[PDB]
């Protein structure tokens, strides 16, 4: 079996696939998303599976892969189970943000 | 001596310091900027010194560090010697660029 983690005793949930660009490609790990889960709880689970223990969830974002050219950003503190496109591919990318500095463009 | 590279035979230049976030910190390397160098040529020199040979200059950008909370983005194909703030610190950061997100 695959091992998963969740902070819910009972109810609806889904298994998604979370990608990370590593070793000149993309490694996908399966992640449990409970109906109550917001983006940071899902990011921590994905980081644990991708062995990013010394890193922080605040430095990453979750984007649902709609197609090869389209991505859907999951807001920083949105409920994943409802913000995601439930009829589209349950494939996501864990992306490091490019961030308290004023940048003159 | 420090070693540098440049595609100019004669004329004015400046030595800038280019930072890369690596090994829980920021390593700075000194980079030669000739009066004729545009951002891609400077980025390639910074990448060589920071050992990013397997990476591409199109994936990075230069930002001049004006202060701890102020930065000046050098446009992708701007002449660095002229786009930079000439009176500010010649300290820069080599940063991975941010890229159809709905």
From Swiss-Prot, chain A:
Q: What are the disulphide bonds in this sequence?
A: none
List-wise, which residues carry Phosphotyrosine?
28
| The Ras-associating domain, residue ranges | 12-99
Tell me where in or outside the cell this protein is found.
Cytoplasm; Nucleus
What does UniProt say on post-translational modification here? Answer: Phosphorylation of Tyr-28 by MET blocks HRAS binding.
- Subunit and partners: Interacts with RIT1 and RIT2. Interacts with OOG1. Interacts with TRAF3. Interacts with HRAS.
- Function in brief: Functions as a guanine nucleotide exchange factor (GEF) activating either RalA or RalB GTPases and plays an important role in intracellular transport. Interacts and acts as an effector molecule for R-Ras, H-Ras, K-Ras, and Rap. During bacterial clearance, recognizes 'Lys-33'-linked polyubiquitinated TRAF3 and subsequently mediates assembly of the exocyst complex.
- Record's domain comment? The Ras-associating domain interacts with Ras.
What this protein is called in its record is: Ral guanine nucleotide dissociation stimulator
What is the organism of origin for this protein? Homo sapiens (Human)
Give the encoding gene's name.
RALGDS
Q: Which residues of the full protein are shown?
A: 793 to 893 of 914
């Amino acid at each position: 079996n695959l091992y998963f983690q969740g902070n819910q005793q009972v109810g609806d949930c889904c298994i998604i696939r979370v990608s990370l660009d590593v070793d000149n490609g993309n490694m996908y790990k399966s992640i449990l998303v409970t109906s109550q889960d917001k983006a940071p709880a899902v990011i921590r689970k994905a980081m644990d599976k991708h062995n990013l223990e010394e890193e922080e969830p605040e430095d990453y974002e979750l984007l649902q892969i709609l197609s090869d050219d389209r991505k859907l950003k999951i807001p920083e503190n949105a409920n994943v189970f409802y913000a995601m496109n439930s009829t589209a591919n349950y494939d996501f990318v864990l992306k490091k943000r490019t961030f308290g500095v004023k940048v003159k463009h």
